[PDB]
Symmetry: D2
C-alpha cells in the first residue's frame, strides 16, 4: 500500500541520502555515496528524480576532463533509470571562501566569484533539463551587529539576482529561480529569514516574474511559524516554484527529519493545501537520515518520506470528500470567507445601515464558529478513526 | 542627563500607560486612567504625543453626544500641553464580535462592520492631525487548520485594505496606513506574521504607495527574528512608516516590556540603525508597565522608555564617530559591502579571469573578517567602557 | 467507537469547560457556567470526575453561609452523576493581592495569607475525597532581575511547602501535594520552570515523600522540551502523582488546546508511556475550548480530549503488541538498553579487555541502529496505515 | 582598564580557542592549534588556566609513548606559564562509536567502553591537578520516540555515574563530578536537558555529595530559560561545582558566542549573582570564536570574554553599593523576601487573625512593588548612565 508512482514527482537531493553524518560535534558515520548509486537506489524506491548542488556532482576544483566524466556517469545513471533532474543549486556555503557569504560577502572579489560559480552551474542545470534553480543563501548574514549593513547587503543581493536574471534572459533559458529562506544556522541570523521576507525582496528585482520561493518545512518552523500558512501566501502570490519537504521539532537547529516526522498535523495540512491548490511542482525532500543509521536505514528513511506524503494525501482527500466535513465547513462559514466582503463597492458599503447602525453586534458575537467539531473531524480523518 | 526634547518625537499609546493590568490569569491591578490624565502626565515627562485606538478614546457604544464630549476633553488636554496625535488605529480585537477576525472573519457581516468601524475612526484620526493609521490584525488567523483558508483570507484582507485606500483617496486625505505584523497571540497563528510577510502583501495592493509597516520590537522577537535586520529590510523597501518600541525576552507571550529591557544589544543596534538612516517618524512606545506597579511605577516605566532610547542614541553615535571604530569597519570591509559587485556589467564579469580562473580562493579564505574586534568596540561603546 | 468508561479516569477542571474566553486582548465570549451544569454535562460525555480551584467553586469573599450553599449544590451534582473529585488546588494567581506571588511574594503578610487560603482549601479538598492537592505557582517569579532574589524565594517556597506538609501530617490526612511547573506566563520567568526543577526542589523538602509533580503537556513544550521524556524522569523518580493533558504548538503563550491537538506525535508517545508504565492516576485535562466556540463547541472540545486519548491508546497498544515491532525493538537493541552495563562490578569492568584494549570501535561504529524503520512502524501504527 | 588577574580564575577549554570552524554546513576555516600554543597565548591574555577533553590533548588512538609525549609537552607549557588545569572531561560524542550515546548507548559494549575511556581520563585529570571532572552527555538522547526508553536510559546513566563514584572513592581521589545539561543538539532531545533535571537526577545517585552541575549560559537559553535563576537554584542546592560562560541569542542551535554577547542583561545578572554569592570556582569560557575570524580574531574574542566579565563585575558591584539602590531594594521589599514567612510556627500562623480574617487584601493589593524604578537603576548602572 502507499506505493510511489511517477506522477507523484517525488525527488531527493543527492546530499540528502548522501549525507555522511558529520554534525557540529561528530565525525561522519557513513561512507560517501557515488551519485550513481543514489540515483539507482532512489529509482528502486519509486522516486521520480534527483537534485544537486554543483559540488555534490563535481568535486570542487575538478579539471574539465574530471567534470565531463562525473557528468557522463551521472547521465548514464539517469538514462538507466528514467530519473529526472528538475532542480539544481550552487554550493555557496561549504568552502571557507564563503565564510561571510557568497552574493553578500563583504569582500567584493568573493561576491564576483560566487556569481561566476553560480553561472557555470546554471549552464549545467539547463543541460540536465532542470526547470528551477534554487538559491539558499546560508552564509548571508551575521553573528554581530556591526559586521553586516543589511541595507547594503540587500543592495548586493538584488544586484546578484538581477545579474543572474540578465544572464538567463540573454541565453534564452526557460529556467526560473527559487529563493530558499532560513532564519538562522549557520549564520547567527540569515538574510531573507522567512517566506515573507523572500517574497517581499523578489518584488524589488528587475524581472520579478523570473523568481519565486523554495520554502522548506523545517526552516519556517525554526521561527515557530505555520508552514501551511506561509505556503498559502506563496501560492496566493503565484510564487511557489518548488518546495522542500522534511520534518522539524520546533525551534531548534535544522533537523531535516524525514517528511511526516516532526509536526505531523502541519504535514497533514500542508499536503491538503498542495493537493487542493493543484501544486504541480516536484515533491522534493531535503532531509537527512540520522547519523545513527546504516545504509539500510538511509533507504528506509527515504522510503518513509514518500510513504508519509501518500498516507497524508489519502487522509486529506477523504477529509475534503466527506459530506459530514463539507457540512461542518459550511457550519463554520468557510464558504462565506471565500465570498467578497463588498463586491457592491465602497459607496454601497458606506450607505448600508446593516453594516453599522443596524448591525446587531451581540447577536453576531453569540454565534459559535464550530471550529472544534471541524478540527476533530480532521483529526479523525488523519488517524483513520471515523466512527 | 538624558532629558527628552520635542525633536525626539517620543509618543505613547493611551493603552500603554493606561493598561489596567489584566492578564490571562489575573484581574486588573490599577484603576482606569482618564486620557486627559495620561496626556498631562506624559507631557510632564517630555513626551511629544499620544496615539489611540477608537475605543481607548470613546467607550464602545457611545452616543454621538458622548463621543463629542470625550473628543472635546481630549483635544483640550492636547491644547493645554502641546501634545500631538501622529497616529491612530482601530480596536478590531477586544469585542467578542471580532473573535474570528475583523477584515478576515469568516462571517461576511462582521467583515463589513469592521470596515465601517475603521472608516469612522480614520475620519477622527484625520481631524486630530494623524499622519499614519495603524492596523494590527490581532484576531486574523486560526487555532486549527480547517478554520481558515489562508488564500481566501488574504483575498479578503487585500479587499479590505484596497477599500480603505479608495476611501482615503476619495476624501483627499494625506494619511497613510501601516500594517503591524505579529506571529501569534491571541490567535494560535496570525496572518502576516512578520515584517516580511506584511511587506510582501503590500506589494499586491492596488495602491501600494499608501501602505507601509509598523513593526514592533517584541513581535519580531516572538519569532526569534533579528529586529534590526527586519527594520533594515523595511527601510530598504521605503516602507518604515511608523515603529513600535518595547522589550521582549525571546520566544514567549508578548511581554511589552519598557524599551531597553529585553534584548538590550538589539535595542542598541536598532537605535544605531534608525539614527544612521535618518528615520523621521515617531519613536512610539507600545509597552505595558508591569501589573506589579502602582501609578508612580507606570510613570517611571514610561520615563525609562525614553531614557533608554537617549542613552543608546548617545552610545551608538559615539561608536560611529570613533576613529578607531571607523578603522575597524574598514578592516572588516564594510566599505566594500557598500560598493557594487559588478558595475562593469554582466559581460565584463563573465570575461574577468580575476573572478574565476585566476581567483585565489585559498588566499581569500585565509583573510580574517576581524568582526570580533569590531563587536568588542561596539560592546565597549554601549557600556561606556572604552579604555 | 472510542467511548469513555469509568476506568479511564478522565477528569476536567471546572475552569476548563468553564473558561469564559477572556484573553490578553479580548473580553469574555461565553457566559459563566454553574459548576452543577459542568458536572452534569461532563458526566454525560463519560468523564469520571472534576477538579477545582477554591475560587472556581466558592466566589472569592463568600460568607460562611454562601460557602456552605455552593458546596452543598456541588455535592448534590456529584451525587446525582457519580462524578468524583480526585484533585483540588488553590487560586493564588487571579486576585491583585497575588501580583508578586503567593508563597514567594516579597511582602511577608501576603505569604502568610496565601498559606492560610491554601490550608482552608486543603480541608475542603479532603472533605470532597481528593487524593492530590496541586500547586501551580503562576505568580512566583519576576519580570526583572533585581525584583526577586531566587535563593531567598526558594527558601520561602520550601518554608511554605514544609508548613503544608506539617499541616496535613498533623491532621492525619492522606492527601499528597503535586507541584505544577511552568516556565513563564504570567510572570516573565516562573520559579520551578520545568519538571526537573520541581523534582530537584522536592528532594530538599523536610518530608519529600508527601510531594510529587503535576506536569502539564503544554508547559514543558513552552520551553521546547520533550514532554514524554520529562514524564519518564518523573516516573523514574516515583513522583508522577497527577498529570495535566492538553495541546500546545511549541514555544508560545500557553494555548491549552484540547488533548491530541498541538504535537500529535508527542501525544502518542505520552499515551504509550503512561499505559506501558501502568500510571494509575487521573487522566486530567487542563484545556480551554477556544473563545471562538459556543457551548456546543465547549462540549465537543471536551469530548475530543477523551476521544484522542482513547485513539492513541489503541494505536500505542497495537504498536507494542505487533510482532514486527517487537522484532524491530530487538534490532535497535532496546532490550540491551534495559540490561545493566556492569552487574559484574567495577573491578571486573576494569579488568575486562573486551571493554577497552580489545574493543573493536570501528566494528561497533559500523552497526546501524535501525531507528528509522522502527519509527516508521510507529508512524504506520499511529495512522492506521500498516501494509 | 579591565585587566584580568590570577584571582579572577578565568579558564578556557582547549577546544574553544582551538575550534577550527567546522559547522553543519562548512569546512574548517582555521588550522589546528598545538595545545602548547593555546596555553602560551591564553597566559599572555591573563587567563588562569585551561581545561581539556581527553581527545583534545591526546589524539584518539594514540600509543602509550605518544600519549606520554603529548602530556609532557603540555605540562612544560603549563610550567612555563603558571597556567592551571582545574577541570577535565571526556569526549563521548565525536567518534562514530558514540552515535547513540556513551553511558546510555543501547549497545552494552559501547556503554562499557565509554566508562573505561572516562576512567582512564579521570586518572590523567587527577595527575594534572583537576578538582572537577565534567560530563556533557551530548549523545545521550534520541531523534524518535521508540529509539530510547528513558526510564531504562536513566537507570544506565545512574549506573555509570555510580561506578565512577565508586572508582574515585576507591582511589582516594578528591575530584568531584559536574554534569552539564543541554536540551538538544546534536541529539533531537538530550537526556537531563536542564539544570533542574540534572539536579534531580543527582539526588538519586548512591553518593550524591560527589556530584554537582556545570551549567552553560547558552544551553539553558536554548530552552528559553533564565540562566541566573537556574544558577540560583544550583547555588541553593549547594551544587554549583563549575560553570561554562558564553553567549547565546535565544532558542537556536548552540552558538557559543563570547561571554557578554547574546543576552547582555542576563550576563549582568549572572555576574551579580556569582559575585554576591561568593562563587569560588573557575570562571570558565566554553565559547567558539566565529569561523569568520583568523587567529588575531580568536585571541580578541577570548580577551573579550574576560573583559566583559570584568566590566559587568564592576557595574554589578556599583549597583549593589549605591545607597539609592539599597533604598530601592527596601522599597521593593527585597529585605522582607529574605525573612521567614512563619518562624512563629504553624499553630501561631493558624491562630493569627492578621493572616486571614483581618488581612486587608485590598490595601495590600494597592501597594506598588516599585520594581520598574529598581530595574531602571540597574540599567543605568550597567550602562554607566547614572545621572
Ligand atoms: Mg475556493
Ligand atoms: Mg552607506
Ligand atoms: Mg522494561
Ligand atoms: Mg541575603
Ligand atoms: Mn534544513
Ligand atoms: Mn532545503
Ligand atoms: Mn506587543
Ligand atoms: Mn504595537
Ligand atoms: Mn497551561
Ligand atoms: Mn495545569
Ligand atoms: Mn554550548
Ligand atoms: Mn560547555
Ligand atoms: Na549599497
Ligand atoms: Na504558485
Ligand atoms: Na477568495
Ligand atoms: Na522607510
Ligand atoms: Na532567605
Ligand atoms: Na510515579
Ligand atoms: Na533498566
Ligand atoms: Na554551590
Amino acid at each position: 500500500n502507499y506505493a510511489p508512482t511517477p506522477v507523484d514527482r517525488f525527488t531527493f537531493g543527492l546530499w540528502t541520502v548522501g549525507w555522511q553524518g558529520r554534525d557540529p560535534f561528530g565525525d561522519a558515520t557513513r561512507r560517501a555515496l557515488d551519485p550513481v548509486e543514489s540515483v539507482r537506489r532512489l529509482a528502486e524506491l519509486g522516486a521520480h528524480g534527483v537534485t544537486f548542488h554543483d559540488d555534490d556532482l563535481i568535486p570542487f576544483g575538478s579539471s574539465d576532463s574530471e567534470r565531463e566524466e562525473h557528468v557522463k556517469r551521472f547521465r548514464q545513471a539517469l538514462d538507466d533509470t528514467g530519473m529526472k533532474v528538475p532542480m539544481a543549486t550552487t554550493n555557496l556555503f561549504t568552502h571557507p571562501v564563503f565564510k561571510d557569504g557568497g552574493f553578500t560577502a563583504n569582500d567584493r572579489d568573493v561576491r564576483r566569484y560566487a556569481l561566476r560559480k553560480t553561472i557555470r552551474n546554471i549552464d549545467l542545470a539547463v543541460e540536465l533539463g532542470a526547470e528551477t534553480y534554487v538559491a539558499w543563501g546560508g552564509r548571508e548574514g551575521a553573528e554581530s551587529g556591526g559586521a553586516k549593513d543589511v541595507r547594503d547587503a540587500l543592495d548586493r543581493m538584488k544586484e546578484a539576482f538581477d545579474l543572474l536574471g540578465e544572464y538567463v534572459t540573454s541565453q534564452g533559458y526557460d529556467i526560473r529561480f527559487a529563493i530558499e529562506p532560513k532564519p538562522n544556522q549557520p549564520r547567527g541570523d540569515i538574510l531573507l529569514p522567512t517566506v515573507g521576507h523572500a517574497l517581499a525582496f523578489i518584488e524589488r528585482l528587475e524581472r520579478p516574474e523570473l523568481y519565486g520561493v523554495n520554502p522548506e518545512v523545517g526552516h519556517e518552523q525554526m521561527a515557530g511559524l505555520n508552514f501551511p500558512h506561509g505556503i498559502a501566501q506563496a501560492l496566493w502570490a503565484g510564487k511557489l516554484f518548488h518546495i522542500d519537504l522534511n520534518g522539524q521539532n520546533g525551534i531548534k537547529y535544522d533537523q531535516d527529519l524525514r517528511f511526516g516526522a516532526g509536526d505531523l498535523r502541519a504535514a497533514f495540512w500542508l499536503v491538503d493545501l498542495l493537493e487542493s491548490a493543484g501544486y504541480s511542482g516536484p515533491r522534493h525532500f531535503d532531509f537527512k537520515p540520522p547519523r545513527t543509521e546504516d545504509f539500510d536505514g538511509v533507504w528506509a528513511s527515504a522510503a518513509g518520506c514518500m510513504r508519509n506524503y501518500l498516507i497524508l494525501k489519502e487522509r486529506a482527500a477523504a477529509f475534503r470528500a466527506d459530506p459530514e466535513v463539507q457540512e461542518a465547513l459550511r457550519a463554520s462559514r468557510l464558504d462565506e470567507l471565500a465570498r467578497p466582503t463588498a463586491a457592491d463597492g465602497l459607496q454601497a458599503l458606506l450607505d448600508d445601515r446593516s453594516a453599522f447602525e443596524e448591525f446587531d453586534v451581540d447577536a453576531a458575537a453569540a454565534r459559535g464558529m464550530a471550529f472544534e467539531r471541524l478540527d476533530q473531524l480532521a483529526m479523525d480523518h488523519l488517524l483513520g478513526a471515523r466512527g
